[PDB]
């Protein structure tokens, strides 16, 4: 007849060993994932323009 679904996998010895060698290979490569903490002259006319825009900016704020 016509079935409809993937039945829930019976976890077995060889599947566990596949998973084991996965984790162990990733151990001896030491590449495991995590969320590490988020951390944190030029020119005459350019310093002239930076100065002007910064003064104007402060006045505006």
């Amino acid at each position: 007849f016509d079935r409809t679904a993937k039945p829930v996998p019976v976890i077995t010895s060889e599947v566990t060993e596949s998973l084991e060698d996965m984790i162990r290979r990733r151990i001896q490569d030491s590449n495991f994932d995590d969320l590490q903490r988020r951390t944190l002259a030029l020119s005459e006319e350019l310093q002239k323009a930076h100065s002007e825009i910064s003064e104007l900016y402060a006045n505006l704020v």
Binding site: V8, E20, I27, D33
Partner: protein, 282 residues
């Protein structure tokens, strides 16, 4: 307060709508970036346009963690509250205790005489990041709901092949070191969503020499979780499994909190479709 969260969700939805209608605009600006990068023919619509070629100075000056988590990814280590369904059962109590032990920054909540909206609002008032609610059948644990609280998302998984740690063996006690994570074979944007929710479910910022590993592998759309302790030998590094093992499987995903029942469904497992057996992740 509650009003502040309400208009917060309003502004988030509006920014989503604008993001949708500005996707194509981002594409046209990227194309013009490439054209100025190398002089080429410019195609018909953007060539004929006047507003784009006028306003492309600020736009040239213009220019990844998901948005519901974006401000507090790796700064404030999350806090999770794990609670049981209703008039609990004793096997379920043991297993929920084991889940509380499995994660760090976790506290347990028996539930008798509560209601879902009062609980969720009380938890928001207290200030809590992430929530886990457990459902069982006849001792056997089978269903798990994860929520992220500032009107974040919820996921609902089923979970089947559970064994308690004590019923593996009367062994001893875990170390509760800030563990590590491995994520295998994840492909889709859904896959990125679930690795994102679980990564922000764990602790943030682990060490360099922490000695507890927690895996997450996709084996045919059945997320298999294990947990082992490892100690580094010279040639073959030995792993001792500890902590419960169970086969977990997604089935639905809401863009609201779990109390809503009518938020935006951003994924939902289709069952009675012609190709249900056929696809993976669908």
């Amino acid at each position: 307060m509650l009003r502040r969260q309400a208009r917060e969700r309003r502004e988030y939805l509006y920014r989503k709508a604008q993001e949708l209608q500005d996707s194509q605009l981002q594409q046209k600006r990227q194309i013009i970036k490439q054209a100025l990068a190398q002089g080429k023919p410019l195609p018909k619509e953007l060539a004929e346009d006047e507003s784009l070629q006028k306003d492309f100075r600020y736009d040239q000056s213009l220019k990844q963690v998901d948005d519901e988590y974006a401000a507090t990814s790796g700064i404030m280590d999350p806090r999770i509250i794990v609670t049981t369904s209703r008039d609990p059962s004793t096997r379920l109590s043991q297993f929920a205790k084991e889940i509380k032990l499995l994660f760090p920054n976790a506290v347990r909540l028996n539930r008798g005489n509560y209601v879902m909206p009062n609980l969720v609002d009380a938890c928001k008032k207290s200030g809590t990041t992430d929530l886990v609610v457990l459902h069982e059948h006849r001792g056997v644990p089978t269903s798990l709901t994860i929520s992220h609280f500032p009107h974040g998302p919820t996921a609902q998984f089923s979970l089947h092949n559970v064994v308690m740690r004590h019923d593996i063996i009367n062994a001893g006690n875990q170390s509760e070191v800030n563990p590590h994570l491995i994520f295998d074979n994840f492909t889709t944007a859904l896959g990125k969503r679930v690795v994102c929710i679980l990564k922000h479910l764990f602790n943030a910022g682990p060490k360099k020499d922490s000695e507890r590993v927690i895996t997450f592998a996709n084996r045919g759309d059945f997320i298999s979780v294990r947990q082992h302790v490892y100690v580094r030998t010279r040639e073959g590094v030995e792993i001792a499994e500890v902590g419960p093992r169970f086969e977990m499987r997604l089935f639905e995903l809401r863009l609201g909190t779990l109390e809503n029942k009518d938020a935006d469904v951003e994924w939902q497992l289709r069952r009675f479709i012609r190709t249900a057996n056929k696809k993976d992740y669908l």
